[PDB]
Amino acid sequence: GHMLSKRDAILKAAVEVFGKKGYDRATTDEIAEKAGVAKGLIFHYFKNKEELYYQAYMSVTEKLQKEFENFLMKNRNRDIFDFMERWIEKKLEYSASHPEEADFLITLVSVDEGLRKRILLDLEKSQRVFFDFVREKLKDLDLAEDVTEEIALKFLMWFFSGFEEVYLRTYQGKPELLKRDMNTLVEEVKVMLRILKKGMTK
Amino acid sequence: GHMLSKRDAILKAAVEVFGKKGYDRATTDEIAEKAGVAKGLIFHYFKNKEELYYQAYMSVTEKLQKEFENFLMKNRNRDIFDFMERWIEKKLEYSASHPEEADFLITLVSVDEGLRKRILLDLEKSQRVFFDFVREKLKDLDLAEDVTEEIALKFLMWFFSGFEEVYLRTYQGKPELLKRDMNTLVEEVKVMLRILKKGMTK
CATH class of the missing domain: 1.10.357.10 (Tetracycline Repressor, domain 2)
Known part of the structure; x- marks a missing residue:
């Protein structure tokens, strides 16, 4: 089955985590874990x-x-x-x-x-x-x-x-x-x- | 000359730093430095x-x-x-x-x-x-x-x-x-x- 693109998967998780924790508290590592992507992929697509x-x-x-x-x-x-x-x-x-x-x-x-x-x-x-x-x-x-x-x-x-x-x-x-x-x-x-x-x- | 009490000095600096940086970004160490007090004094008076x-x-x-x-x-x-x-x-x-x-x-x-x-x-x-x-x-x-x-x-x-x-x-x-x-x-x-x-x- 078709899943979200990796960018869209990361964006979905980012919306979730930032909504729950705010910008400062949210971590890219937990966004990557939530998105099911390797930690390095956040840099790859979004730099920071x-x-x-x-x-x-x-x-x-x-x-x-x-x-x-x-x-x-x-x-x-x-x-x-x-x-x-x-x-x-x-x-x-x-x-x-x-x-x-x-x-x-x-x-x-x-x-x-x-x-x-x-x-x-x-x-x-x-x-x-x-x-x-x-x-x-x-x-x-x-x-x-x-x-x-x-x-x-x-x-x-x-x-x-x-x-x-x-x-x-x-x-x-x-x-x-x-x-x-x-x-x-x-x-x-x-x-x-x-x-x-x-x-x-x- | 009379200066602020140490508690009031810490409160003044805290108002300054939290106003400038927000709660999350602000650090107790920079509050203590701004207040001119030893880092341990923030615990002493305010716990966390x-x-x-x-x-x-x-x-x-x-x-x-x-x-x-x-x-x-x-x-x-x-x-x-x-x-x-x-x-x-x-x-x-x-x-x-x-x-x-x-x-x-x-x-x-x-x-x-x-x-x-x-x-x-x-x-x-x-x-x-x-x-x-x-x-x-x-x-x-x-x-x-x-x-x-x-x-x-x-x-x-x-x-x-x-x-x-x-x-x-x-x-x-x-x-x-x-x-x-x-x-x-x-x-x-x-x-x-x-x-x-x-x-x-x-």
Whole structure:
């Protein structure tokens, strides 16, 4: 039978180990053992632990970017709050079904400043797709006289990205709890987004 | 001349080193060197790196809790949004003037689950003072018919604690940038809190 390529096997194990232990504590030797590959193969394909973490982070985010681009195509004409609510539902469902990936993504805060900055620089183009979309949609919003497009944008992007950081951190290692709470979380999101819309608009 | 006690000297250096390097990377040997104490003195007073981090975290939060209790006494009768806006201004001013302490506090996310949980358990009583205050003040609010006291509470506590996490992370190591941006940040906070109040209330 077909198995994962050795690179993909190493990436899988890396996602697992880094999600469980964080970047600093994780060891390349235990990643290789988990992947079932000789210790030297990690150098062969990924040079060092920093590059391995980088490649894993880019591999997982590329999958997420594909999910987003598919959603965006189908939902681009929606009201922005409606869009955000629906996308948040999808991200919750994805995180519950990809708990190892979810635990892995939240480790970025743990890494040293050089590596974190490298990743954030390299992800900016992909993350800007959603940002620029919200920015264009805010033109369709009838904003309160005292609320600038800039504050609206800042607040909405914080809500969206902060909600994600909170639930990933809260349910880290506990996907059955996320699944138990998702109906509640979704109802809560709907109300919070309604509060933001009402407060932002005329 | 009077110098710091050896415990306080070690705690000072620990705050510095942990803020700069995170928990995992920081070494007790470099903390002792920075503190000007023999390497054995860290064991003598703090047993291990985990206990040292714990004691430093508790020492810094105790200072912050005193600042909060002083503010609360003077401001308890205020409207809750007004209260929050004013407290956020004070926390911004404190972080700019205590940049080492600020950088240190944000490292909690980096530590292993056992230590993080220990700290969160032990801080719950102190953090509940503010939480319970917001909860009582929400009774004075004329909430929209569709907004429960529970969602209001959740949303306000996320705004307050999330804003703090974002600015501490954003300005980590850069107190001159925080000082340059504080007037802007404060104006932004005022508008966001106004948006929340409008959206939450009748």
